[PDB]
Design an enzyme around this catalytic site. Structure first.
Site, PDB file in Angstrom:
ATOM      1  N   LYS B 285       0.840  -1.191   0.000  1.00 12.20           N
ATOM      2  CA  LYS B 285       0.000   0.000   0.000  1.00 12.20           C
ATOM      3  C   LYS B 285       0.878   1.244   0.000  1.00 12.20           C
ATOM      4  O   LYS B 285       1.769   1.379   0.840  1.00 12.20           O
ATOM      5  CB  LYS B 285      -0.931   0.003   1.211  1.00 12.20           C
ATOM      6  CG  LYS B 285      -2.114   0.948   1.101  1.00 12.20           C
ATOM      7  CD  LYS B 285      -2.401   1.614   2.437  1.00 12.20           C
ATOM      8  CE  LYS B 285      -3.839   2.095   2.525  1.00 12.20           C
ATOM      9  NZ  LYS B 285      -4.180   2.618   3.875  1.00 12.20           N
ATOM     10  N   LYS B 297     -10.457  13.055   7.681  1.00 12.71           N
ATOM     11  CA  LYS B 297     -10.155  12.610   9.031  1.00 12.71           C
ATOM     12  C   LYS B 297     -10.251  13.795   9.988  1.00 12.71           C
ATOM     13  O   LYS B 297      -9.254  14.454  10.277  1.00 12.71           O
ATOM     14  CB  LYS B 297      -8.764  11.976   9.094  1.00 12.71           C
ATOM     15  CG  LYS B 297      -8.608  10.742   8.222  1.00 12.71           C
ATOM     16  CD  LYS B 297      -7.152  10.322   8.119  1.00 12.71           C
ATOM     17  CE  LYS B 297      -6.998   9.060   7.287  1.00 12.71           C
ATOM     18  NZ  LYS B 297      -7.682   7.890   7.906  1.00 12.71           N
ATOM     19  N   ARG B 374      -8.006   0.006  -0.289  1.00 16.75           N
ATOM     20  CA  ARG B 374      -8.535  -1.175  -0.955  1.00 16.75           C
ATOM     21  C   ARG B 374      -8.776  -0.903  -2.435  1.00 16.75           C
ATOM     22  O   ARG B 374      -8.811  -1.826  -3.246  1.00 16.75           O
ATOM     23  CB  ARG B 374      -9.829  -1.632  -0.281  1.00 16.75           C
ATOM     24  CG  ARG B 374     -10.982  -0.651  -0.417  1.00 16.75           C
ATOM     25  CD  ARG B 374     -12.130  -1.027   0.501  1.00 16.75           C
ATOM     26  NE  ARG B 374     -11.814  -0.749   1.899  1.00 16.75           N
ATOM     27  CZ  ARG B 374     -12.622  -1.024   2.916  1.00 16.75           C
ATOM     28  NH1 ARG B 374     -13.798  -1.596   2.695  1.00 16.75           N
ATOM     29  NH2 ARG B 374     -12.251  -0.733   4.156  1.00 16.75           N
TER      30      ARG B 374
HETATM   31  C1  LIG Z   1     -13.285   2.843   8.529  1.00 12.37           C
HETATM   32  C2  LIG Z   1     -12.154   3.855   8.343  1.00 12.37           C
HETATM   33  C3  LIG Z   1     -12.024   4.725   9.593  1.00 12.37           C
HETATM   34  C4  LIG Z   1     -12.464   4.748   7.138  1.00 12.37           C
HETATM   35  C5  LIG Z   1     -10.841   3.110   8.089  1.00 12.37           C
HETATM   36  O1  LIG Z   1     -10.761   1.890   8.228  1.00 12.37           O
HETATM   37  N1  LIG Z   1      -9.823   3.894   7.718  1.00 12.37           N
HETATM   38  C6  LIG Z   1      -8.494   3.359   7.395  1.00 12.37           C
HETATM   39  C7  LIG Z   1      -7.961   4.131   6.188  1.00 12.37           C
HETATM   40  O2  LIG Z   1      -8.036   5.358   6.143  1.00 12.37           O
HETATM   41  N2  LIG Z   1      -7.440   3.373   5.215  1.00 12.37           N
HETATM   42  O3  LIG Z   1      -6.930   4.062   4.040  1.00 12.37           O
HETATM   43  C8  LIG Z   1      -7.606   3.495   8.459  1.00 12.37           C
HETATM   44  C9  LIG Z   1      -6.381   2.842   8.402  1.00 12.37           C
HETATM   45  C10 LIG Z   1      -5.476   2.963   9.448  1.00 12.37           C
HETATM   46  C11 LIG Z   1      -5.799   3.739  10.555  1.00 12.37           C
HETATM   47 BR1  LIG Z   1      -4.578   3.898  11.960  1.00 12.37          BR
HETATM   48  C12 LIG Z   1      -7.023   4.394  10.614  1.00 12.37           C
HETATM   49  C13 LIG Z   1      -7.928   4.272   9.566  1.00 12.37           C
HETATM   50 ZN   LIG Z   2      -7.806   6.265   4.257  1.00 19.05          ZN
HETATM   51 ZN   LIG Z   3      -5.080   4.765   3.891  1.00 16.61          ZN
END
Ligand SMILES: CC(C)(C)C(=O)N[C@@H](C(=O)NO)c1ccc(Br)cc1
Ligand SMILES: [Zn+2]
Ligand SMILES: [Zn+2]
Ligand SMILES: CC(C)(C)C(=O)N[C@@H](C(=O)NO)c1ccc(Br)cc1
Ligand SMILES: CC(C)(C)C(=O)N[C@@H](C(=O)NO)c1ccc(Br)cc1
Ligand SMILES: [Zn+2]
Ligand SMILES: [Zn+2]
Ligand SMILES: [Zn+2]
Ligand SMILES: [Zn+2]
Lengths: 517, 513, 519
Positions: B285, B297, B374
């Site tokens: 990633k 965020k 993803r």
């Molecule tokens: C449900 C949501 C809060 C949107 C999430 O899983 N975010 C991922 C993210 O932004 N992936 O790109 C995430 C990944 C790591 C951390 Br620490 C916090 C949020």
């Molecule tokens: Zn994200």
């Molecule tokens: Zn991310």
């Protein structure tokens, strides 16, 4: 034993239906090679088409009716497909010039149905049972199924078919009418006939737990729940013992007693025991978390998404154990001794409640610094596990709606299991396979233990790590010194949010564990 | 290399990288503990424990060939100290030759078998003494039991924690010699130079992650991957926007639309000199910064100031490329992949609700712009499967739910192939980078059914780590595939630095395969 | 004493208090440096600095009465080490009598005048050397400049941090705890500093006693058990005491104080301790401490994130500091002065009997108050306590309280704020802040905000709405209950609890005592 009241209208007992409409169903199993009789009621075929997704319906079974057999020719059935969950109703006349009802339920294209797929099949079958006043149902198995999944079919069928109307008054279903006969045509019928009554037992065990969970917190209280456990034990000829406040005080269960301090209902410790005739080879203690209502205490569940209106299910752990007690007490396994335990109380807000910061002493001498009053389950379980270990058992298995973090880890389908002994964990997992109540193994990460180190007490109640399920397991682990112990967190799977009703998760899992050990 | 765009002239145009670290200059010799210890130079630390006696006294068993130090290490003096895990003492004195030396110990608890987490605390205690040391030599005497993997882990960890990143800066000096007294010295000698390689591979990844998003951008990160490839004689190819459009990577291109930096797809390749018997694709990633997009965020605890870490999957893969390119395994062909972009808010930005088309033809309804990982991985996995490999392993800081499930120590692994799952878990054991197997529950698959698109990006609602796996699973059709979520274990919050998690795990995976 | 009510028999009925600490068994010897240093058993630590030279080399200036040790500590050998603040090193060597001795140093930075904050870092660094080492004697050699107050502060902080509270330990008692029995101090002009020693030991326990109470949980420390401790303390010090119960409080019409405690299972207890000099009394002082044994916030429950409800046993600090002050005063016995130690103790809980938001209550001075927030219970209890204090006919009224969380946003965790209606009294407290080395900052009572306390129906509002400067508004409220006596308010909500160390500071004890002594 006497349930206290605020007003006279307060209920003083949990309404429990022991004789359910399912128990009045006569169930017969026939061999499918002998041919099917299609005479009265509704006849449903369970069909599939391996390899060909959404393939056509073909009835392979021989039907002992010239007219029905002609209706069920491949040419007539080609218009329908076998997609999982698909159902159709047929209306026709048989050889004896009587009007009969026939149909089918699609079982997909996979030869081996998952427990979720079989659940989808059954739920689809129940829809055909609802809103129809049938007197008899016949199910013809044109798919391959083993003894466990066949039993699972019946259990699920019974559970979903039944409708809990204990709390209905002016809205009782005027159209509810259960079948009186159940016919089952299947391959090698003689091997499946024994699974029928075992399914009916597993059914009520699950539904008995369900009745206990579905009951609100004004009906199901620490006292009324304990009174129900006694009544159950009395009916099953199980030895029973209910410990009151004075006895708990002598056992110095400060953690368990603290949780109930703010309640109008006195703490009640449930102790049921089943002992086999003859030599005992295994001694087992099953501990169920029995919080009749969880307000959260002074750490009140006020934040969005805390689901306080549901928190009456916080005794699902206890319910599973009592349901298991019914099954074990009915089937009567040999060479085993089972202790059914539950430290029952209510977590409320009062001038008498325990506060965040309070240091309490468990029955094993350890001082505990309370960092969150809503983590009361591990406190009641702490004293419960100590009590359990003093019984001198081979295995300690607890089941609890412990952490909401399970909804973020495994979700609503799989329960999580933690333990200090891999052998016992594997036994739980094997039980999960045979009971078809899915459980996934989660780790107890010892690196997090340092976060439970209290500055003044021996140990902290909570961390201050966000992995709540693991940290909670670390806490409970501190109260089992030298005994094989497993912890099943069912906080995420206990309540069926889609169906707005309990699952009664745990009964079959724990029973298969006790029986197949 | 491509030219990194700037807003102002003061904007950095490269990621600072240190290849020659002081650790590489440390001469390491391993002696057998049966012959006794020579304490003539520098700092000598004994790793001691007391089994069965919790917080028990310290007792030095080994014979030291110095009268002055022997008097110091006598039981009556050492029993005033205890073996509580992490506890340290060290004293300065003159030896028999009237030379200034330092002698001490680190408590290793009362457990005979140390975990990798226990070894971390032991090392950290040791490093604290080193960051306060001017001496030229460190000698570590193992009066405890450790196997080859834990000893190599000890060396990897020691080296890593010892090193301090001062690239963005504007006491002590590093040692020149490391002595190790341990049982069966000859057996552990082979682990020394392997540890030093695993060291930099992890630290290189750490350097990339720690590098802020104004320094580490899609273009500069791809340039660094190229420079690394040239140093390791690896075949490389960096796909640009025009070519990504030709490959129709709509899901990947949509994430980077709002960025001032063009999307860059990194493809490094290691090929054996002999006959190739196994092809592996490692997918990382590569979000250099994740603002969350229009799903910003903004909520408390969303940790937006740490979102430079959102590249850790790419850094781990690139770090593995170093280890693989250096150790040079045989009969294997490894492809290092990373769809690198930046997640920003702009007029050109992707929107919530947008339906985008992946490179495999599947249409995806975006329900949350913050679930962009993803999306980028989706096109990456489609690319990976086109290479015709045996194993596809992606590693990503994918879901924040990991912090609530496994926490900050254990990573989660998901997959469609149990044998591949077992290989990752076996690699977890030998690399001492803890990973736990989590299920892909197919009952949740139905929550991804979009009303209009082929599939939903996210769920209605809970087990987001499992849902994210279910999404990625839709982009691998007929290849053994595993998914490692390191969102919780990537950043060392206590130490305020990266862990470089995954580098040693992935390398052990391709080496012991 | 009153009998502590219980929900279950396992509920504790008293606060565990340790009066005789291992610190009290420590013999303290002070020597003049010009006489030379003796290095024998235990650990000998030098406090060194290098003025103007950041991270400069270590140089031992003091004469060491040992040929071997003097050679070890010569400049050539010590150069390799530096004087960075907090840095410490351990030395091992054999002395003239062929005995093994332990020597070391603690870096005191490059500033010639150490601040109070710097000194605590020095001490904390020194304590690490005392921990996990079974020493029988510690020797501290001062090669830095300190005044008599800073020297005393060193001993107080050393004693306080060295001590470990294990009252609530059971199966996790530290098996390796073994305190020193002797403390040697080498310093220039020793006889001038020797008088500070026992003052430090008294100031130490006064601080630690308060700390013991604060750290004690709310199920151990309740209004009944806390008041019982005050009686026990007063009896040991022969202080006059009076504990007022509900019936007496009802007769005095303390509606504000009684309303807070309505929802508690523990009856309200008003603590009144008195120290009188055996000679002509020239100065009369009242010390008022907020005494909420637990603050759930009431129906304005502390449910918001970061509200720290698990810490709310700490709402005791004002009362604890005042009781700790009573120990120091009762022990040191000042002349020509009479001190009143006051605290309206209760517990803020949620119940059917609890007071409600919107409730109008009447203080003992006739003023009616409209409750807008039950979590602002401190000023209500203090309101009646200030009226009680002024009825005593005193010269000064000084209150100390963990009143407003806004202090964390204003002064932070190190400096307490002081408000008042009398400038001369405020300056006296500020001087006490200097001599006690307990940091206090003067904050204004802005009269422009008084109008926001204008109630539509009651005489005065409990809280404001349009200000958001809660600390100043809270002072404006309190000022309304002191008619014609010099009054000061010390808000210690931010500085009371040490978040990093996860323990109380005992803040206020030394400050209030220095205030009483030098007046
Ligand atoms: C449900 C949501 C809060 C949107 C999430 O899983 N975010 C991922 C993210 O932004 N992936 O790109 C995430 C990944 C790591 C951390 Br620490 C916090 C949020
Ligand atoms: Zn994200
Ligand atoms: Zn991310
Ligand atoms: C972290 C915290 C919010 C305190 C939690 O996990 N509570 C448990 C609980 O009520 N324990 O007694 C919990 C358990 C199940 C569900 Br659903 C929600 C919360
Ligand atoms: C304005 C408000 C946020 C209500 C406040 O100052 N509360 C006090 C309090 O509860 N006083 O009784 C307060 C005091 C200390 C801390 Br820490 C937090 C809140
Ligand atoms: Zn709870
Ligand atoms: Zn609960
Ligand atoms: Zn309050
Ligand atoms: Zn308060």
């Amino acid at each position: 034993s006497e349930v206290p009241q605020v007003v006279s209208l307060d209920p003083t007992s949990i309404p429990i239906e022991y004789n359910t409409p399912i128990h009045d169903i006569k169930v017969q199993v026939y061999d499918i090679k002998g041919g099917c009789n299609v005479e009265e009621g509704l006849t449903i075929f369970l069909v599939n088409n391996p390899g060909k997704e959404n393939g056509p319906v073909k009835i392979s079974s021989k039907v002992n009716d010239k007219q029905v057999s002609e209706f069920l020719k491949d040419e007539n059935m080609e218009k329908f497909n076998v997609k999982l969950g698909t159902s159709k109703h047929f209306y026709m006349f048989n050889d004896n010039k009587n009007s009969v009802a026939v149909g089918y339920v699609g079982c997909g294209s996979v030869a081996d149905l998952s427990e979720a797929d079989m659940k989808r099949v059954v739920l689809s079958l129940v829809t055909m049972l609802h809103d129809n006043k049938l007197s008899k149902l016949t199910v013809v198995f044109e798919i391959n199924v083993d003894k466990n999944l066949f039993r699972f079919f019946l259990e699920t069928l019974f559970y979903e078919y039944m409708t809990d109307e204990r709390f209905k008054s002016t809205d009782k279903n005027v159209n509810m009418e259960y079948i009186k006969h159940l016919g089952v045509y299947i391959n090698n019928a003689d091997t499946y006939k024994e699974e029928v009554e075992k399914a009916r037992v597993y059914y009520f065990g699950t539904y008995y737990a369900s009745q206990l969970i579905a009951a609100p917190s004004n009906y199901c209280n620490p006292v009324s729940l304990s009174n129900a456990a006694v009544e159950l034990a009395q009916k099953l000829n199980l030895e029973y013992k209910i410990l009151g406040v004075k006895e708990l005080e002598e056992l110095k269960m400060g953690a368990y007693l603290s949780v109930g301090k703010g309640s109008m209902y006195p703490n009640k410790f449930i102790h049921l025991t089943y002992k086999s005739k003859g030599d005992v080879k295994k001694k087992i203690a099953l501990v169920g978390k029995g919080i009749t209502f969880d307000s959260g205490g002074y750490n009140l569940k006020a934040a969005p998404g805390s689901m306080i209106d549901l928190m009456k299910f916080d005794m699902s752990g206890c319910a599973a154990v009592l349901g298991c007690a019914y099954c074990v007490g009915t089937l009567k396994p040999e060479n085993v001794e089972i202790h059914f335990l539950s430290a029952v109380c209510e977590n409320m807000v009062s001038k008498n409640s325990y506060r965040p910061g309070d240091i309490i002493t468990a029955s094993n001498g350890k001082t505990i610094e309370v960092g969150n009053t809503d983590a009361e389950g591990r406190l009641t379980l702490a004293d419960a596990l100590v009590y359990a270990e003093k019984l001198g058992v081979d295995y300690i298995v607890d089941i609890a709606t412990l952490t909401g973090a399970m909804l973020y880890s495994l979700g609503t389908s799989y329960a999580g299991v933690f333990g200090n002994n891999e052998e016992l964990i594997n036994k739980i997992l094997q039980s999960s396979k045979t009971s078809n109540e899915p459980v996934w193994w989660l780790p107890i990460i010892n690196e997090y233990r340092a976060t439970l180190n209290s500055k003044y007490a021996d140990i902290n109640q909570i961390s201050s790590v966000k992995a709540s399920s693991i940290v909670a397991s670390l806490f409970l682990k501190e109260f089992v010194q030298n005994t094989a112990w497993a912890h099943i967190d069912i906080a995420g799977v206990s309540w069926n949010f889609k169906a707005r009703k309990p699952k009664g998760f745990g009964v079959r899992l724990l029973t298969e564990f006790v029986l197949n050990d």
